Amino acid sequence: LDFFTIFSKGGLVLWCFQGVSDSCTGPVNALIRSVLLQELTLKYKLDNQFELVFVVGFQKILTLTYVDKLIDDVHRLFRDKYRTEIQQQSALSLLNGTFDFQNDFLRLLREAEESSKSLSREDMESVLDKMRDHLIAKNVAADIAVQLCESVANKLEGKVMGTFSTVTSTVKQALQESLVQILQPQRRVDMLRDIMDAQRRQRPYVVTFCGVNGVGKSTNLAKISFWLLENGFSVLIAACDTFRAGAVEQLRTHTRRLSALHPPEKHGGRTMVQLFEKGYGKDAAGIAMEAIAFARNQGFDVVLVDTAGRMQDNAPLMTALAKLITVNTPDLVLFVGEALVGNEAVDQLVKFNRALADHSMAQTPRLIDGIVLTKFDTIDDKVGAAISMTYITSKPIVFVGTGQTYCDLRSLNAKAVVAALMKA
């Protein structure tokens, strides 16, 4: 154990250890991996009763059994010796308490280096099983509904319940809060403001639509082409789907239908929707690079790159797709996944994001930047495909397709999707 910090959940360092040698090295990266990213090996132990976190830094992962016994005795001596300072609601009990735990830890560390030489989980057991069987039947991935349920027996273990609460309604509630915060990815988006920033180098805005076969990449690409034209934007559809029959005439019917609603006469006199196509059988990274150089020269604010649908287990073809998105450097990689897929929503995005970073040759690789959740009008409340997607990926559901026309494109109501999923 080279490191040990104990702070509260309100972000207040109570006590820290870094050895007599220098001091206080890496207490912030310790907090980040251990509390920030969970809602030298850097692990943690949570006291959820009194809102404490016990972050430790060690090597030789095989000594994890004695490092866990040292966090358990330090956690038992800390919450007993300072039970008065940590049990009060006021943050002025911890600001005014004196946590001189250095001589108690040096004794628990030197003594654990000789061994090397309320709400329990039994109560919350039955309701975490009825909630896991409700998420799975409401189309949350089978294992996403298992980690979700265990994030809640952890969060409420030790904690006292309200004046009017049961075992059932507590794990049922903190599972809704751990589900809205994970369906709240660490990302945001914008509009014309974002193409003014793409004009800081005088270049268009290139979005890449990727995904598995039949989800709605081409049809929702046309709902977003109608949504960009509605905001006054000219969009050049790059037809890089050269692995199918009628993949260019599908996009040419979308360009004929969109250059009818938004013609040059009703736009100022200039072309606003135009298809860039090179036929079938051509390279999809060569038609895409020609359409970015063509939209720059012909003045198209947006390029919407349509790619062919593929599986998730194709080493010679997820190589060519991951190399396309790595090299083309698109502004927003939009994974298109249907709201009808079940447990495959996890395997699609994990292999789609693992490919984009493997066959990438950068330091920080270009990963999927969002999700388009299509066929939303087909599940009717079996909505757990939105949770399975923003769970594994910490990327937002940029659009939610709700039909086949251009007007069936919605923003995500992520609050009522967890309220429908956590109500059983």
Residue ranges for the known binding site for Mg(2+) are: 218, 241, 306
Does 169 bind ligand GNP (CB under 6 A)? Our answer is no
Decide the pairing of beta strands 205-210 and 302-307: parallel
Q: What are the E-state strand segments in 142-293?
A: 205-210, 235-240, 273-277
From the CB of 398, what's the least distance to ligand GNP, in Å?
A: 13
Shortest CA distance to 216 belongs to which of 372, 382, 422?
372
Among 77, 320, 327, 357, the residue binding other proteins under the rule CB under 8 A is 357
Q: Which option in Mg ion, other proteins, ligand GNP, none does residue 97 bind, with CB closer than 5 to 8 A by kind?
A: none
Q: Which residues contact 52 (CB under 8 A, 6 or more apart)?
A: 6, 7, 8, 9, 14, 46, 75, 78, 79, 86
Please calculate the CA angle 395-305-353 and round it to the nearest 5 degrees.
35
Shorter beta-carbon distance to Mg ion: residue 124 or 240:
240
From the CB of 379, what's the least distance to ligand GNP, in Å?
A: 10
Among 44, 66, 99, 243, the residue binding other proteins under the rule CB under 8 A is 243
Residues 326-345 that bind other proteins (CB under 8 A): 340-344
| Coil vs helix vs strand at 36 | helix
Please calculate the CA angle 103-106-109 and round it to the nearest 5 degrees.
150
Does 359 bind other proteins (CB under 8 A)? Our answer is yes
One-letter amino acid for residue 213 of the chain: N
From the CB of 122, what's the least distance to other proteins, in Å?
A: 25
Query: Tokens at residue 98, please?
Result: 């004196």
Shorter beta-carbon distance to other proteins: residue 124 or 182:
182
| Known binding-site positions | 218, 241, 306
CA 300 to chain centre: 31
Shorter beta-carbon distance to ligand GNP: residue 145 or 215:
215
Q: Among 113-121, 181-189, 208-216, 315-323, which window interacts with ligand GNP (CB under 6 A)?
A: 208-216
Query: Tokens at residue 110, please?
Result: 């030197």
Shorter beta-carbon distance to Mg ion: residue 212 or 389:
212
Does 315 bind other proteins (CB under 8 A)? Our answer is no
Does 330 bind ligand GNP (CB under 6 A)? Our answer is no
From the CB of 51, what's the least distance to other proteins, in Å?
A: 6
> Which helix or strand (DSSP H or E) is residue 307 part of?
strand 302-307
Q: Which option in Mg ion, ligand GNP, other proteins, none does residue 60 bind, with CB closer than 5 to 8 A by kind?
A: other proteins
From the CB of 299, what's the least distance to other proteins, in Å?
A: 21
Q: Is the dihedral of CA 63, 68, 73, 77 positive or negative?
A: positive
From the CB of 242, what's the least distance to ligand GNP, in Å?
A: 11
- Inter-residue contact 218 to 246 (CB < 8 Å): no
Shorter beta-carbon distance to ligand GNP: residue 34 or 225:
225
Q: Which option in Mg ion, ligand GNP, other proteins, none does residue 116 bind, with CB closer than 5 to 8 A by kind?
A: none
CB atoms within 10 A of CB 162: 9
Query: Tokens at residue 67, please?
Result: 């490092």
Main-chain phi, psi angles of 161, to 5 degrees = -85, 165
Q: CA–CA separation, 159 vs 173, rounded Å?
A: 13
Q: Among 28-36, 167-175, 388-396, 397-405, which window interacts with ligand GNP (CB under 6 A)?
A: 397-405
Does 192 bind other proteins (CB under 8 A)? Our answer is yes
CB atoms within 10 A of CB 416: 10
Query: Tokens at residue 303, please?
Result: 């390029």
Q: Which residue, judged by CB position, is nearest to ligand GNP in the bound state?
A: 309
Q: Among 72-80, 188-196, 258-266, 285-293, which window interacts with other proteins (CB under 8 A)?
A: 188-196
Question: To which residue do tokens 């090299």 refer?
Answer: 327
Shorter beta-carbon distance to Mg ion: residue 127 or 222:
222
- Inter-residue contact 337 to 217 (CB < 8 Å): no
From the CB of 220, what's the least distance to Mg ion, in Å?
A: 10
Q: What are the E-state strand segments in 114-213?
A: 205-210
String of contacts with ligand GNP for each residue 214-253, x by CB under 6 A: xxxxxxx--------------------x--x---------
**Size of the residue set binding other proteins (CB under 8 A):** 95
Does 138 bind ligand GNP (CB under 6 A)? Our answer is no
Residues at the interface with ligand GNP (CB under 6 A)? 211, 213-220, 241, 244, 308-309, 374-378, 401-404
